[PDB]
Each structure stands twice: as C-alpha cells, then as structure tokens.
Design a protein around this motif. Sequence first.
Motif, PDB file in Angstrom:
ATOM      1  N   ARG A   1     -21.229 -16.623 -27.997  1.00  0.00           N
ATOM      2  CA  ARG A   1     -19.852 -17.108 -27.982  1.00  0.00           C
ATOM      3  C   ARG A   1     -19.302 -16.965 -26.564  1.00  0.00           C
ATOM      4  O   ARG A   1     -18.518 -16.064 -26.272  1.00  0.00           O
ATOM      5  N   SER A   2     -19.713 -17.874 -25.684  1.00  0.00           N
ATOM      6  CA  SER A   2     -19.302 -17.870 -24.280  1.00  0.00           C
ATOM      7  C   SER A   2     -17.886 -18.423 -24.161  1.00  0.00           C
ATOM      8  O   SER A   2     -17.667 -19.629 -24.142  1.00  0.00           O
TER       9      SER A   2
ATOM     10  N   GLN B   1     -13.826 -18.210 -22.202  1.00  0.00           N
ATOM     11  CA  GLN B   1     -13.268 -18.310 -20.860  1.00  0.00           C
ATOM     12  C   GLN B   1     -11.796 -18.661 -20.984  1.00  0.00           C
ATOM     13  O   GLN B   1     -11.390 -19.242 -21.988  1.00  0.00           O
ATOM     14  N   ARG B   2     -10.999 -18.300 -19.978  1.00  0.00           N
ATOM     15  CA  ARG B   2      -9.556 -18.507 -20.074  1.00  0.00           C
ATOM     16  C   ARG B   2      -8.906 -18.207 -18.730  1.00  0.00           C
ATOM     17  O   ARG B   2      -8.246 -17.180 -18.584  1.00  0.00           O
ATOM     18  N   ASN B   3      -9.061 -19.108 -17.774  1.00  0.00           N
ATOM     19  CA  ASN B   3      -8.304 -19.032 -16.538  1.00  0.00           C
ATOM     20  C   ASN B   3      -6.854 -19.382 -16.820  1.00  0.00           C
ATOM     21  O   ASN B   3      -6.558 -20.060 -17.801  1.00  0.00           O
TER      22      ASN B   3
ATOM     23  N   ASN C   1      -7.850 -14.813 -14.937  1.00  0.00           N
ATOM     24  CA  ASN C   1      -9.058 -15.342 -15.553  1.00  0.00           C
ATOM     25  C   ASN C   1      -9.653 -14.299 -16.481  1.00  0.00           C
ATOM     26  O   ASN C   1      -9.616 -13.110 -16.179  1.00  0.00           O
ATOM     27  N   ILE C   2     -10.185 -14.739 -17.614  1.00  0.00           N
ATOM     28  CA  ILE C   2     -10.761 -13.850 -18.612  1.00  0.00           C
ATOM     29  C   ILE C   2     -11.994 -14.527 -19.183  1.00  0.00           C
ATOM     30  O   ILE C   2     -11.954 -15.047 -20.301  1.00  0.00           O
ATOM     31  N   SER C   3     -13.082 -14.526 -18.431  1.00  0.00           N
ATOM     32  CA  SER C   3     -14.363 -14.979 -18.944  1.00  0.00           C
ATOM     33  C   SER C   3     -14.883 -13.978 -19.964  1.00  0.00           C
ATOM     34  O   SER C   3     -14.387 -12.857 -20.061  1.00  0.00           O
ATOM     35  N   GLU C   4     -15.887 -14.398 -20.731  1.00  0.00           N
ATOM     36  CA  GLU C   4     -16.473 -13.539 -21.758  1.00  0.00           C
ATOM     37  C   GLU C   4     -17.632 -14.278 -22.406  1.00  0.00           C
ATOM     38  O   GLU C   4     -17.453 -15.395 -22.892  1.00  0.00           O
ATOM     39  N   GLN C   5     -18.801 -13.656 -22.428  1.00  0.00           N
ATOM     40  CA  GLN C   5     -19.957 -14.175 -23.139  1.00  0.00           C
ATOM     41  C   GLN C   5     -20.365 -13.171 -24.203  1.00  0.00           C
ATOM     42  O   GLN C   5     -20.050 -11.986 -24.089  1.00  0.00           O
TER      43      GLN C   5
ATOM     44  N   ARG D   1     -23.011  -8.435 -23.954  1.00  0.00           N
ATOM     45  CA  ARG D   1     -21.591  -8.769 -23.971  1.00  0.00           C
ATOM     46  C   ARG D   1     -21.078  -8.787 -22.532  1.00  0.00           C
ATOM     47  O   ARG D   1     -20.400  -7.862 -22.087  1.00  0.00           O
ATOM     48  N   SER D   2     -21.399  -9.856 -21.810  1.00  0.00           N
ATOM     49  CA  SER D   2     -21.009 -10.021 -20.410  1.00  0.00           C
ATOM     50  C   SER D   2     -19.543 -10.434 -20.334  1.00  0.00           C
ATOM     51  O   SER D   2     -19.196 -11.599 -20.487  1.00  0.00           O
ATOM     52  N   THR D   3     -18.673  -9.470 -20.064  1.00  0.00           N
ATOM     53  CA  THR D   3     -17.241  -9.701 -19.958  1.00  0.00           C
ATOM     54  C   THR D   3     -16.848  -9.883 -18.487  1.00  0.00           C
ATOM     55  O   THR D   3     -17.688  -9.844 -17.589  1.00  0.00           O
ATOM     56  N   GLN D   4     -15.555 -10.097 -18.247  1.00  0.00           N
ATOM     57  CA  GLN D   4     -15.008 -10.339 -16.920  1.00  0.00           C
ATOM     58  C   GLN D   4     -13.505 -10.510 -17.052  1.00  0.00           C
ATOM     59  O   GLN D   4     -13.025 -10.887 -18.119  1.00  0.00           O
ATOM     60  N   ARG D   5     -12.765 -10.225 -15.982  1.00  0.00           N
ATOM     61  CA  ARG D   5     -11.307 -10.263 -16.065  1.00  0.00           C
ATOM     62  C   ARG D   5     -10.711 -10.102 -14.673  1.00  0.00           C
ATOM     63  O   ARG D   5     -10.167  -9.046 -14.356  1.00  0.00           O
ATOM     64  N   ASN D   6     -10.779 -11.149 -13.867  1.00  0.00           N
ATOM     65  CA  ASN D   6     -10.051 -11.183 -12.612  1.00  0.00           C
ATOM     66  C   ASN D   6      -8.569 -11.332 -12.901  1.00  0.00           C
ATOM     67  O   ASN D   6      -8.189 -11.818 -13.963  1.00  0.00           O
TER      68      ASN D   6
ATOM     69  N   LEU E   1      -7.178  -7.249  -9.359  1.00  0.00           N
ATOM     70  CA  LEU E   1      -8.009  -6.324 -10.120  1.00  0.00           C
ATOM     71  C   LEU E   1      -9.075  -7.091 -10.895  1.00  0.00           C
ATOM     72  O   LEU E   1      -8.798  -7.621 -11.971  1.00  0.00           O
ATOM     73  N   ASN E   2     -10.294  -7.129 -10.373  1.00  0.00           N
ATOM     74  CA  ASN E   2     -11.435  -7.680 -11.089  1.00  0.00           C
ATOM     75  C   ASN E   2     -12.132  -6.573 -11.860  1.00  0.00           C
ATOM     76  O   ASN E   2     -12.224  -5.448 -11.378  1.00  0.00           O
ATOM     77  N   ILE E   3     -12.607  -6.886 -13.059  1.00  0.00           N
ATOM     78  CA  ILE E   3     -13.269  -5.919 -13.922  1.00  0.00           C
ATOM     79  C   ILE E   3     -14.419  -6.624 -14.617  1.00  0.00           C
ATOM     80  O   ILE E   3     -14.318  -6.958 -15.800  1.00  0.00           O
TER      81      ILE E   3
ATOM     82  N   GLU F   1     -18.294  -6.665 -16.214  1.00  0.00           N
ATOM     83  CA  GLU F   1     -18.962  -5.724 -17.110  1.00  0.00           C
ATOM     84  C   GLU F   1     -20.032  -6.470 -17.890  1.00  0.00           C
ATOM     85  O   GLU F   1     -19.733  -7.474 -18.536  1.00  0.00           O
TER      86      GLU F   1
END
Lengths: 151, 151, 151, 151, 151
Positions: free
Chosen positions: B76-77, B79-81, C69-73, C76-81, D68-70, D72
């Motif tokens: 479940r890839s 995303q939300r810029n 930005n809030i990517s997420e796969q 569980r490869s997350t991200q949140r710039n 703030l990038n996070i 993971e």
Amino acid sequence: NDAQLKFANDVESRIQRRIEAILSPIVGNGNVHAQVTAQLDFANKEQTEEHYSPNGDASKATLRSRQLNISEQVPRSTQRNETSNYEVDRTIRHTKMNVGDIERLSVAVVVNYKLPLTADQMKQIEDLTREAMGFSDKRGDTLNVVNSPFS
Amino acid sequence: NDAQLKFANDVESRIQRRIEAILSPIVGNGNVHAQVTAQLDFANKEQTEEHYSPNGDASKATLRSRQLNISEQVPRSTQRNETSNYEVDRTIRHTKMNVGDIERLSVAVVVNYKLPLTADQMKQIEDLTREAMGFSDKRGDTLNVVNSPFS
Amino acid sequence: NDAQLKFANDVESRIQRRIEAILSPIVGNGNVHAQVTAQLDFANKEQTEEHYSPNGDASKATLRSRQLNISEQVPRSTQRNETSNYEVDRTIRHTKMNVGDIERLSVAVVVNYKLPLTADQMKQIEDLTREAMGFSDKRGDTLNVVNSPFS
Amino acid sequence: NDAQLKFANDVESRIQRRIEAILSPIVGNGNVHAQVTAQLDFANKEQTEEHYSPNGDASKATLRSRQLNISEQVPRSTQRNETSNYEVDRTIRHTKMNVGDIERLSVAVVVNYKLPLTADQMKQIEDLTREAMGFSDKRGDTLNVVNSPFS
Amino acid sequence: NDAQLKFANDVESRIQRRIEAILSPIVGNGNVHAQVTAQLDFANKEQTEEHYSPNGDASKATLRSRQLNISEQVPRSTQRNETSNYEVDRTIRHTKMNVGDIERLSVAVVVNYKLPLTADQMKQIEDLTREAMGFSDKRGDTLNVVNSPFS
C-alpha cells in the motif's frame, strides 16, 4: 508638558461642576462637595489590525484558479493533484488613538445633614452621581458618597 | 532637568489640595493636613508590539494557495505532498509612553481631635482620601491617616 | 557637573520640608528635625528589549507557509518531510532612563520631648514619615526616628 | 583636574552639615563635631551588556523556520534530519556611568560630655549618623563615634 | 609636570586639616600635629574588558540555528551530525581611570601630654584618625600615633 496638569484639571473641574449642579437641587445650594480624580492617557498610540476571513470551509472560499487532476487505474492506483489559488477577504483598520482620554475616575462626594439622610435618599444620590461622572465599571471607576454634618 | 522637581511638586500639590478640600467640610477648615509623595516616571519609552493570530487550527486559517497531491497505490504505497501558503492576521501597536506619569503615591494625613474621632468616623475619612488620591493598589499606593491633637 | 550636588540638595530639601510639615501639627512647630540623604542615579542609560513570543506549541503558532510531504509504503518504508515558515509576535521596548532618579533614601528624624512620647505615639510618627519620604523597601530606604530632649 | 578636590570637598561638607544638623538638637549646638572622608570615582566608564534569552527548552523557543525530515524503513534504517532557525529575545543596555559618585565614606564623630553619655544614648547617635551619611555597608562605609570631653 | 607636587600637597593638606579638626576638640586646640604622605597615581590608564557568558551548558545557551541529523541503521551503523550556531551574551566595559588618585597614605600623629594619655584614650584617637584619613587597608595605608610631651 505640564500643560497636561492644566488639561487634567479641566477634565476634573467639568465632572465636578456637573455633580454639584445635579445635587444642588436636592440637598441644597451648598450642602454638597465633590472632588474628582482623573487618570488620563497621554501616551501616543497607533494601531493597525489586518484581519482576514477564514476560508477553510469550501462553501465559503473564493477560488481564483483551481487545477484538479484525478487520475485513477483499476491494484487500485489512484491519484488526485489539486492546486487552488484563493481570493481572501481582508479588513484593515488603522486607528490613531486620542491623547488625553480618561482611563479611570475617582469621585468623592460629601453631602451635608438635613439629621442623617435616609438610606434610600442616599442611594438616589449615589445613582445621580453615577451618571454625572459617566461612571463606567470597565474603566474601574470608583465613587464614594458619605453623609456627615459640615462645619 | 530640575524642572522635574517643579513638575513633581505640581502633581503633589494638586493631590494635596484635593484631599484638604474634601476633608475640610467634615473635620473643619484647618483640622486636617495632608502631604503627598509622588514617584514619577521621567524615562522616555517606546514600544512596538506585533501580534499575529494563531492559524494552527484549519477551521480558522486563511489559505492563499494550497497544492495538495495525494498519490496512492494498492503493498500500500501511499503519498501526500501538501504545500500551503497562508494569510495571517497581524496587529501592530506602537505606543510612545508619556513622560511624567505617577508610578506610586504615598499620602500622609493627620486629622485633629474634636477627644478622638470614632473608628467608623475615621474609616469614612480613609475612604474619602482613597478617592482624592486616585488610590490604585496596582501602583502600590500607600495611605496613612492618623488622628492626634494639634498644637 | 557639581550641579548634581545642587540638584541632590533640592531632592533632599523637598523631602525634608514634607517631613517637617506633616509632623509639625503633631509634635509642635519646632519640636521635630529631619535630615534626608538621597543617593541619586546620574548615569546615562539606554535599553532595548526585543521579546519574542514562544511558538513551540502548534496551537498558538502562526504559519506563513508549510510544505508537508508524507510518503509511506507498506517492510514499512515511511517518510515525512515538513518545512514550516513562521510568523512571530515581537515586542520592542526602547527605554532611555531618567538621569537623576532616587536610588536610595536615608532619613533621620529627632522629635523633642513633651517626658518621652508613648511607644504608640512614636509608631504613628514613624508611619507618617514613612509616607512623607516615599519610603520604598525595594530601593533599600532607611528611616530612623529617635525621641530625645532638645537643648 | 584639581577641581575634583573642590568637588570632593563639597560632597564632604554637605554630609558633614547634615550630621551636625541632626545631632545639634540632641547633644547641643556645639557639642558635636563630624569630619567626613569621601573616596569618589572620577573614572570615565561605559558599558554595554547584550543579554540573550536561553532557548534550549523547546517549550520557550521561537522558531522562524523548521525543516524536519523523518525517514524510516523497517533491519530498522531510521533517519531524522532537522534544521531549525530561531528568533531570540535580546536585551541591550548601554550605561554611561556618572563621574563623581561616592565609592566609600568614612565619618568620624566626637560628641561632648554632658559625665559620659549613656551607652543607649550613644547608640541612638550612631544610628542617627548612620542615616545622615547615607551609610551603605556594600560601599564599605565606616563610622566612628566617640564620646570625650572637649576643651 | 611639577604641578603634581602642588596637587599632591593639596591632597595631603586636606587630610591633615581633617585630622587636626577632629582631634582638636579632644586633646586641645594645639596639642596635636599630623603629617600626611600620599602616594598618588599620575599614570594615564585605559582599559577595555569584553566578558562573554559561558554557554557550555545547553540549559542556558541561546541557539540561532541548529541542524541536527540523526541517521541510524540496525551491525548498528549510527550517525549524528549537529551544527549549532549560537548567540552569546557580551558585556563590554571601557574605563578611563582617573589621573591623581591616592594609591597609599601614610599618616603620623603626635598628641601632647595632659602625664600620658590612657591606653584606651589613645585607641579612640587612633580610631578617629583612621576615619579622618579614609584609612583603607587594601591600599596599604599606614598610621602611627604616638604620645609624647611637646616643647
């Protein structure tokens, strides 16, 4: 800059004449004395609000532009880009406050004896003075009326 | 710069006349003496607030722009810029305080004997003076009325 | 620059007249002597605060921009710039202190005998003088009233 | 530059008159002698503090920006970049001290005999002089009152 | 430049008059002699401190910027870059010392006989002179009072 003590004495002497002029009919021509203390505001002061109106609800926003892409494949690869340029309602007050406004009043009233005045006859003197001051409780005004025989 | 002792003596002599003028009816023409001490503020002083209004809650923010992309695949890839440019409500006061305001008052009152005055008759003298000073407790004003026979 | 000894003597002589004028009714016309010592501040002095308001809590910050930005796969490869530009509330005082303010007072009072004065009759003299000085304990003022027969 | 011995003699002669004027009622018109020594400060002196306020605690910092990038992944490859630009509260005093302030006083007082004065009658003379000097212990002032018959 | 012997003789003659004026009541009009030696400082002298405040403790530092990356994999490959720009509190005094200050005093006093003076009567003469000099032990002042019959 000591013309502010002359000015603050004009503010006090006008409130004081008004209190004696409205109580002289009741208690008598010279059976009442009032002394007014005014704390004035001689600080210069400007201000400039700049309110905006919340457009977070779409049923009351005003768009200028709006580019809304809505791709979708069906493994349900969705997508939904959406730029939105807005027009915003904006008020802009700009006050320049008055130098010399009353910040707080203190009035002291002594009324002669007739023999003390009746407690009801003394409330209708507190209430008349409360209107001759311009008594405002949000300014923190203070009034003290006492009844005691003169000399 | 010693015209500030002349000015501070005008402030004291006006508060002092007001206290004798409101107590002379009660106690008598010359049975009361008051001396006022004023600590004045002769410091120049400017100020410039510049408040903003919190727009952390979206139900009260004002967007100017907003680019919100929301990709999503379905493993479940997501995303939300989401860029967001804001318009902010801004007040800007600019005071220039007055040179010569009372910072603190100290008043000392002596009232003659009639034979001491009654404790109630002496409270209604403290309260009258508390209004002829402009007595403010936030300034730290102090009043002392004592009753003692003159000479 | 020795006009500061003339000025400091005007400050002392005014506090001293005020103390004799409020005690002369009680003890008598010439049964009281006061001497005032004033430490004045003749240092020039400017200042310029520049407070800001803490915006660490998001429920009271004011954003100007915000790119989140809030990517997420989903392994569980997350991200949140998340950039965030702020608007900050800013006060800016600018005082220019007064040259010649009292830093500390020391007053010495001698009152004649009537035969000593009563310990209560002597407290109501300390308290009257404590108001004729402008006695402030935060300045470190000091008062000493003694009772002793003159010559 | 020898006008500083003239100035320092004006400072001493004023403190000395004040001590004789407050003790002459008690001991007599000419039964007291005082000599004052003043160490003055004739050094020019400027200063310029520039305090800042600690913003190490996030509950009282003021951010201007914050990226703030996070990242993971989950073998738990974490990451957390975090730039932070701050706004800082800054005071800036700028004193220019006064040339000619008392650094330290030394006073010597001799009081005549009546027959020695009583040890209590001599403390109430030390305490009166301690107020006519402006006696400050943080300056390191020193006072010596002795009782001995004149000639 | 020999006007410094004239100046240093004014400093000595003033301390010397003060010592004779405070001992003449006790011992008699002409039963005391004092001679003062002053070592003065005629060196020009400037100075400029420039203190800073230690910000080694994070609970009292003031950051202007701070870029803190904290990578980490988990074979536990860690990392922690961390730039930090600071704002520092800075005082800057700038004295220009006075030319002609007393560095050290030496006073010699001879008091006549009455018959020697009592050892207690001679301590209360050392202590009076210790106040008429402005005796400071940190300057290294020295006093010698001897009792011996004149001629």
